[PDB]
Design a protein around this ligand. Structure first.
Ligand SMILES: CSCC[C@H](N)[PH](=O)O
Ligand SMILES: [Zn+2]
Length: 547
């Protein structure tokens, strides 16, 4: 059995989970559930990204400690993910003792190895509040068009871009005082030293083609040293031997992947697995599911950091595109900027899991949630192709044959056609070609419904002396359903539980090789109901009003 550690990017603690986040967590959860079905040792890990100036300032506005605020958001996040049944083995935080010790360890090792440099820089400073200001916390009049109240390095009127130092009449967004340039010593990570190593990895053919192409652009532009320190006031980890200096959030964030796993091991009383997974000589596999906006950190800084601190590097990076709703970026004003919590007030988790999965592929292309198509696809595929296979046959079995399935398969050849597809469908789940897996599964479902139509059980049911025939027909349809739900198990956790309760059996990948014969099934209430555009409209309206 393989030993696999899978992660999703760590959500920032200063915002609610939305449909963008869910695309990633659902993609990874489907892959993880499939890996568990094939018998491998899997560790699905995540955590909240809880450090940084934005977080520090928000807590100060709310009138509470950053600890309290991140504690509340952590609970909010986990509640939403649980509602979508994301099966984490552990959900921790970057603000923990495990991450502190690991961040300090890696830093000391990098420093000892000569990968840390000291350098003084100039930056805007709020003399009143007594803190350096990140670009987005500086505002004034645009140098070009002279438009007042512009933020950061760009103007929202003429679209011009510039250094905040070029702003006319600058003002601290925090205190309102006029900021001034001030010097400060910073610590840098020498990424350029790992150039050749990284180019080799890019060239190995492991990463996605589109990712490798993006990386060549970055090497062409040239790698630079990375500033990894921030001055107090700051909500984060203090740098050893450097009073008033802290690790920049992006330095400790990925280490959080390690901290969450150490936390899991420690809680389990397991004293050997952390090293078995992170040591240089590991035979375990490590995968990170991430979005295209953070590929630079994960494909360049991260592998380099690990190499320089004597740890293993990622086995692979699985990148996905952005989520769009009705073809465009989520829009607050149109009500398409949807929170995960809000979605669950209107629809169930399985519906979205299925829709995203049917559109996902191994490439980094954007995924579009077309609301009109969502209603049509869910009703057509889940309700009318798969669930229909059970509902149209279970009634006769429970009422005419006391819930007992036939002693033999009515059509052995057809059943073999279904089991024969396991190899290709499983390879589809394995390679992340989710769209192909769903197409193959639904094609089988069409085959199953065609079989039922050919047999016409509603006709056989009303013809004298054909009881045995009816039971055989309906049992055959139910077994085809058994197979289909097995292939879809990684996708629809809840519908799967309802199906296993009806079938009186847990669905395992290898189990399909033994059909249910002379087997008792239970009566069942609706396994899945239809949805409609009225519900979609309510979702959009609720989302409009929430912002
Ligand atoms: C180590 S992954 C960190 C990801 C950022 N918090 P954001 O959700 O891109
Ligand atoms: Zn302007």
């Amino acid at each position: 059995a393989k030993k696999i550690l899978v992660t999703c990017a760590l959500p920032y603690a200063n915002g609610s989970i939305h449909l963008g986040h869910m695309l990633e967590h659902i993609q990874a959860d489907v892959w993880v559930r499939y890996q568990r079905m094939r018998g491998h040792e899997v560790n699905f890990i995540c955590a909240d990204d809880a450090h940084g100036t934005p977080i520090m300032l928000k807590a100060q506005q709310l009138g509470i400690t950053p600890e309290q605020m991140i504690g509340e958001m952590s609970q909010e996040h986990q509640t939403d993910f649980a509602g979508f049944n994301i099966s984490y083995d552990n959900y921790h935080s970057t603000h923990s003792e495990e991450n502190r010790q690991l961040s300090e360890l890696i830093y000391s090792r990098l420093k000892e190895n000569g990968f840390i440099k000291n350098r003084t820089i100039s930056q805007l400073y709020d003399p009143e509040k007594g803190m350096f200001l990140p670009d987005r916390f500086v505002k004034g009049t645009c140098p070009k068009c002279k438009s007042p109240d512009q933020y950061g390095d760009n103007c929202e009127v003429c679209g011009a871009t510039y250094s905040p130092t070029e702003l006319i009449e600058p003002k601290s967004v925090v205190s309102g005082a006029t900021p001034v340039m001030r010097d400060s010593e910073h610590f840098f990570f020498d990424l350029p030293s790992f150039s050749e190593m990284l180019q080799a990895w890019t060239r190995s053919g492991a990463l996605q083609e589109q990712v490798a192409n993006k990386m060549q652009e970055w090497f062409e532009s040239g790698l630079q040293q990375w500033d990894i320190s921030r001055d107090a006031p700051y909500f984060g980890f203090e740098i050893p031997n450097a009073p008033g200096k802290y690790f920049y959030v992006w330095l400790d964030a990925p280490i959080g992947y390690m901290g969450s796993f150490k936390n899991l091991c420690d809680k389990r009383g397991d004293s050997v697995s952390f090293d078995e997974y992170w040591k240089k000589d590991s035979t375990a596999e490590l995968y990170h599911f991430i979005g295209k906006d953070i590929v630079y950190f994960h494909s360049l800084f991260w592998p380099a950091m690990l190499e320089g601190s004597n740890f293993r590097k990622p086995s692979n990076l699985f990148v996905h595109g952005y989520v769009t709703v009705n073809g465009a970026k989520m829009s607050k004003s149109r009500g398409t900027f949807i929170k995960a919590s809000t979605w669950l007030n209107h629809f169930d988790a399985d519906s979205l899991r299925y829709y995203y999965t049917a559109k996902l592929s191994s490439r980094i292309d954007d995924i579009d949630l077309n609301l009109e198509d969502f209603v049509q696809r869910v009703n057509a595929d889940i309700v009318n192709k798969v669930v229909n296979l059970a509902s149209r046959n279970a009634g006769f079995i429970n009422k005419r044959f006391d819930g007992v399935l036939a002693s033999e398969l009515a059509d052995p050849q057809l059943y073999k056609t279904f089991t024969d597809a396991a190899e290709v469908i499983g390879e589809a789940w394995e390679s992340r070609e989710f769209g192909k897996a769903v197409r193959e599964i639904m094609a089988l479902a069409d085959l199953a419904n065609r079989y039922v139509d050919e047999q016409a059980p509603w006709v056989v049911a009303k013809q004298e002396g054909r009881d045995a025939d009816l039971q055989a027909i309906c049992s055959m349809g139910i077994n085809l359903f058994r197979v289909l739900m097995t292939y879809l198990k990684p996708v629809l956790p809840k519908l799967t539980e309802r199906a296993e309760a009806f079938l009186n059996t847990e669905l395992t990948w290898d189990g399909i090789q033994q059909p249910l014969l002379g087997h008792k099934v239970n009566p069942f209430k609706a396994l899945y109901n239809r949805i409609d555009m009225r519900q979609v409209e309510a979702l959009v309206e609720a989302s409009k009003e929430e912002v």
